[PDB]
Amino acid sequence: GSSGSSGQPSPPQRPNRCTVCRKRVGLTGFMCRCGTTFCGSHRYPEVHGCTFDFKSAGSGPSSG
């Protein structure tokens, strides 16, 4: 059976999905400060209850 691959070469370049509704944000997506991506509608922190985790890491060299 002469085969090679079944599907399509579509690697995850810059795939982004709203952590609130997973609307696949991108065109106008907003990456919250906490470190997440949301939609223009869920871009606000209060909307997705921003849980910015601070002083929660004791490794690697510091910086500013």
Ligand SMILES: [Zn+2]
């Ligand atoms: Zn959303």
Ligand SMILES: [Zn+2]
């Ligand atoms: Zn946030």
